[PDB]
Amino acid sequence: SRPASDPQVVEAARKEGRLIIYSSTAQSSAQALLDDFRKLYPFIQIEYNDLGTQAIYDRFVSETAAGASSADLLWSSAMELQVKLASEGYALPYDSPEAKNWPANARLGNLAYSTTLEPAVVVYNKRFLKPEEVPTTREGLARLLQEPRMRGRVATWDPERSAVGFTILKADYDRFPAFQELARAFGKAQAALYSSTGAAFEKVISGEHYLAYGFFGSYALLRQRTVKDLGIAYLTDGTVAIQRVAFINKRAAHPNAAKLFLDYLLSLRGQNLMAYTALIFARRETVVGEATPQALYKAVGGKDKVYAIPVSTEILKNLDPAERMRFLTFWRQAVR
């Protein structure tokens, strides 16, 4: 199919001829979306900047303050930092014709959009933990992490170096009491903390760690295709899902190309490519592939077991000084 972007937007994008993206989405995961978008619009040259979540925010803020050339479109899993920018005058307001059935809690009006529904999962090395040895609950994981063989064998986010690590672990801490017992077991097992999914996965795949907690199901599914010893367990006591937020730079030199790419990401065509080929867990329910809401809900025991972090200014509470102090003070004491 073809995204329902307005014909006048398509022609204005052709005049621009160019699209600059700042994205946290691994190029390995995004590449099939970029390639399909270029098939749709061969007259748009894409510059894809694969950057850390904190670095996107810092660089966009600096470039905008200096009046400098910046991104047309920002796409990031650090939901608080995306919602912060889009609620502070950095977003081009645009009603996507592809987002008409987006729930209100999946969009910041016309300022920013959910593009995914990606679970925080457990990945493990099947050579060292068999599927049946991996518990699917926080209390069961706390129990496994008491075992001497697990000491040195756990990876999780560093929520002080990854903005999305913070998004995920803060939401886990807020929603699941059992997260506290688990975080103390991170301490017991001397969990190593990583600022990126790839650094954690590299150590699970070598076997330096047996298990990684809290990383994206999308990246786990894509890595599984080339690494057969990679296992994925879905939490059945409650799964946190992030929504990667896209918005258009208000000061985009190529606003119309950004509109076409945003529409593409929200379209059936783009969400189906996520679900089927990129193995990015899609936001749209009416998709076919492995990385779908249907598949996620089946793995966790139902939709009610998924806490989907909303694309809302309410989540800026996570950036409040008192709220970061409570979370970090507890976190640092538990995992030392």
The side-by-side arrangement of strands in the sheet containing 113-114 is: 45-50, 18-23, 73-76, 245-248, 113-114
If phi > 0 it is left, if psi is from -120 to 50 it is alpha, else beta; for residue 170 that is: alpha
Q: How many residues does the chain have?
A: 336
What SS3 state is found at 186? helix
The Cβ of residue 320 has, within 10 Å, a number of other Cβ atoms equal to 10
**Dist CA 280 CA 257 (whole Å):** 22
CA-based nearest residue to 53, from 257, 240, 197, 222: 197
Contacts of residue 244, defined as CB under 8 A and 6 or more positions apart, other chains included, come to 24, 25, 75, 76, 77, 114, 115, 116, 118
Are 235 and 300 in contact, with CB atoms under 8 Å apart?
Answer: yes
Give the span between the Cα atoms of 148 and 154, in whole angstroms.
12
Breaks in the chain after (C-N > 2.5 angstroms) = none
Nearest to 275, CA basis, from 121, 283, 233, 220:
283
Provide the 3-class DSSP secondary structure of residue 152: coil
Please report which residue ranges of the chain form alpha helices under DSSP H: 7-16, 27-40, 53-66, 79-86, 138-144, 163-175, 179-188, 197-206, 217-224, 255-266, 268-273, 293-300, 321-335
Neighbours of 102 (CB within 10 A): 16
Which residues touch 262 (CB under 8 Å, ≥6 apart)? 73, 94, 96, 113, 246, 247, 248
Q: Are 25 and 244 in contact (CB under 8 A)?
A: yes
Determine the Cα–Cα distance for residues 69 and 262; give it in Å rounded to an integer: 20
Break the chain into its structural domains and give their ranges. Answer: 1-116+243-319, 117-242+320-336
Alpha-carbon distance of 198 to 188, in angstroms, equals: 24
Q: Name the 3-class secondary structure at 76.
A: strand
- φ, ψ of residue 301 to 5 degrees: the values are 100, 10
**φ and ψ at 257, to 5 degrees?**
-65, -40
Centre a 10 Å sphere on the Cβ of residue 93 and count the other Cβ atoms it contains: 13
Solving technique for this entry?
X-ray
Query: How far apart are alpha carbons 119 and 214 in whole angstroms?
Result: 8
Burial label for 288, CB within 10 Å (0-12, 13-18, 19+), is exposed
DSSP characters over 246-293: EEEBTT-S-HHHHHHHHHHHHSHHHHHHIIIII---BS-SS--SSSSH
How far is C-alpha 263 from the geometric centre of its chain's CA atoms? Answer: 19
Q: How far apart are CA 112 and CA 262, in angstroms?
A: 10
Element (H, E) at 95: none
Helix (H) or strand (E) holding 45: strand 45-50
- Give the integer Cα–Cα distance in Å for 292 and 95: 25
Neighbours of 328 (CB within 10 A): 15
Residues 6 or more apart whose Cβ sits within 8 Å of residue 188: 145, 146, 151
| CB contact burial 111-145 (16+ within 10 A = b; e otherwise) | bbbbbbbbbbbbbbbeebbeeeebbbbbebbbebb
- Dist CA 168 CA 159 (whole Å): 8
* Contact call for residues 116 and 281 (beta carbons, < 8 A): yes
Closest Cα to residue 201, out of 179, 222, 186?
222
Amino acid at 177: P
Tokens found for residue 249:
């730079």
* Burial environment of residue 184 by CB neighbours within 10 A (0 to 12, 13 to 18, 19 or more): middle
Quick check: 152 and 252 in contact, CB under 8 A? Answer: no
- Residue 50 · residue 23 · CB < 8 Å: yes
Residues 6+ apart with CB under 8 A from 5: 13, 97, 98, 259, 260, 263, 264
